Structures are given as C-alpha cells and as structure tokens.
Amino acid sequence: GFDLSTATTLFWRPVPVHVKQQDREDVLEELTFRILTGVAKQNHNLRILRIHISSDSDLFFLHTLEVSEEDFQSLKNDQGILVDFASFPGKIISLLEKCILAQPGDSPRFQAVLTIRGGESVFKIVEINDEKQLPHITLAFRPGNDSVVKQFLAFRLSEVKGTCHDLSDDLSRTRDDRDSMVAQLAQCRQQLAQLREQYDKH
Amino acid sequence: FDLSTATTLFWRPVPVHVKQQDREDVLEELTFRILTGVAKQNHNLRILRIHISSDSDLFFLHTLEVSEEDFQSLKNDQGILVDFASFPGKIISLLEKCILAQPGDSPRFQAVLTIRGGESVFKIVEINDEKQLPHITLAFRPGNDSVVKQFLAFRLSEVKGTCHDLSDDLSRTRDDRDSMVAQLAQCRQQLAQLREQYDKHLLEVQ
C-alpha cells in the first residue's frame, strides 16, 4: 500500500473545523491537516495522495482519505471536480487556507465542516453568503480504527523522536560554541587588563 | 491503573535472548520500564506494571501487571521470598546484572524472553559453565492492537514534551551565544581603542 517512508508533505497545519458527531454536541475545534503524496509499495508507478485529520488534544482521534492516480476518476465523477489528480492537493490547500484566515464578520465566510456518522465521515469546505451555503469541496473520510490509529501513532512517534534527535544535536553544537566564545571573551578581557598595566609606563 | 499518579522505578535497555515459536533465536536490546501506582476504580489498590518494548520495532510490546492483592498467587507459584513492596527491587538488581554481564563471565546472568504465541515467558538465569539456575521467571502477555495503541499514544505525548523542553533550551542557549559574540566584539573594540590611545600618547610624550 502507501509507504509513509517515501512520502512527501505538501501541507501540515491546524485548521478551525466545525465537528458534528451523532449523539454528541456540535463543537468548533482546531484540527491538524496533513496532505501527503507518494507511491505504492507493490507498484512504484502508482501515484497516491493521503489526507489525515487529527487532534493534538485527542491522540486517538483520526480521520483518513486515500486516493491513487487510477481511482481518482471515480472520486472526480459524482463530485464534478474540474481539476486533475496532480492539481487536486492544490485545490484542497487554498480552500483550507481560506478557512484558516476567516474572520468573524466575514460574508462570504469560508467554513470547514466534519460530520461524523458512525463508521463514515464527510469533510466539506463551504462558502457562507448570509443565508446560502455553497460547497467548494466535499470529501469522504473514514474514522479510526484500532489497527489504523496504531500505525499512525508509530509513524508520529518515530517522526517526533527524530526531530527531537536533531534538536539535541543543535543544542550540543550551540553549547560548544557558547563555551568557546566565553574563553575568547575571557582571553580578550585578559589582554585588555594587561595592556592597561603596560600603559604605566610612567 | 492510574498512569497519571504512576512512578517509574526502572527504565533502561537490557540485552535479551528472544526465542520465538517458528522463528530463529536472536539477541536483541529491549527496553524495560517498571512503574508503580494505584487503580482508577480503587485508590487503595497498589499495582506494579512492567513493559518490554523495542526502539527498532514500534509494534513490539509485552506487558506484566500485578496488584498488591494478586501478588500472593504470583509469590506461591514461584517461591519468591520477598513481599510486594520488595518485588520491583528484586527485579531491578537482576536486570542490572544482565545489563553489566560481559562475554567471558561465568557465573553469567542472562535475560530470556520465550514467545509461544498469545503468551510469553521472561526469565533471568545464572549460567555457571553447564548448569542454568533461574533467579526469576515471569508471565508476560504480548500486546494486542488496543493495548499497543494506548502505549504509543503515551510514548508520543511523553517524547513531544521532552522535545518542547529541548527546543526551549536551544532558544536560551542560542540567545546566550549571540550575547557573548556582542560582548567579545565590544571587548575587541575597547582593546583596539586603548591601543591607539597608548601608541599616540607615548609618541606625543617625545
């Protein structure tokens, strides 16, 4: 399937989403959106796009979408999506960018909506002009399950563990440099105090 | 089991001899973490939990969990002289022995994890030439999808946190480094200016 190793992040930012769940109350949450593009393990010629909706506050919350260069004609059909596969992530980004920048008094107002109906969920980005609500994109996401959330958290962990390692390396290098500057400052202060004595010389 | 009020008593990699049914024997370095706390349901019930994981296989997990109550069965089915409070200490010293063991040693302390599928047995053995004498033998359950999920979410928030702290120190360190360079440059300026004031004043007084 999809190899999160050879993957490329195109977008990875929190977006203000209106989450609507089945027997729970409507809530405005800030959810993380990551748009990934790569290939299939089985066939290195099959391009795939992956989208993840997660929360930094709920580490178990996850919603996923996955479409190959092939199956894109199915998704494109029924939706009316004018754009091709290569163009698709760009259409998604600009729309999520509009939602990010939306301000209270706005009209037309761009709003992201995630409707959770048990084992399936629908993500839409809508343009709200007073009464009328016009959708720019409507997508089909699958929530959970235990096996998928498990793999995601293992990916996230190795990822954070890695950026942690890099931070540690810079801190070492920075601390080493700071220590060298103090030695140089002390030597300069010594030269300065010695020159002052050499000034007397009376 | 309260993971909020929990306490880590041990947390280190130990060299373990992993034996699996249908696979070849392997010497791996596995992470051991010993925690003690209480039950969510009853704040009066003391519990001990031990996790065996790998930094190389993020899905590998084997767990052991015993409450102050359940200890007596574990104690009888073993001959363990020590009480519940004393038990983690017995485990630690044995894990230290395995950690410090060197190749040519005899008596040599060795950690062994046997996987039969659905169940796994962890033992710490003393090897004096031929004879192998076990000091501890424990029953571990390999983690399922739901248990591995919770573990990785715990690990992630934990690393995400120590990552934040590292970032803060790097900011503070970088700020200090930048200030030292400014101080060094100012000192070098003062030094060059004094030199001109000296040179001139000595030429002038002639």
Numbering used by the authors:
A (entry chain B): 15 to 216
B (entry chain A): 16 to 221
The authors write:
Here, we demonstrate that the centriolar protein SAS-6 forms rod-shaped homodimers that interact through their N-terminal domains to form oligomers. Proteins of the SAS-6 family comprise an N-terminal domain with the evolutionarily conserved PISA motif, followed by a segment with a predicted coiled coil and a less-conserved C-terminal region predicted to be disordered. Furthermore and in conclusion, because these residues are well conserved among SAS-6 orthologs, we propose that the self-assembly of SAS-6 homodimers into a 9-fold symmetric ring structure is a fundamental property at the root of the universal 9-fold symmetry of centrioles.
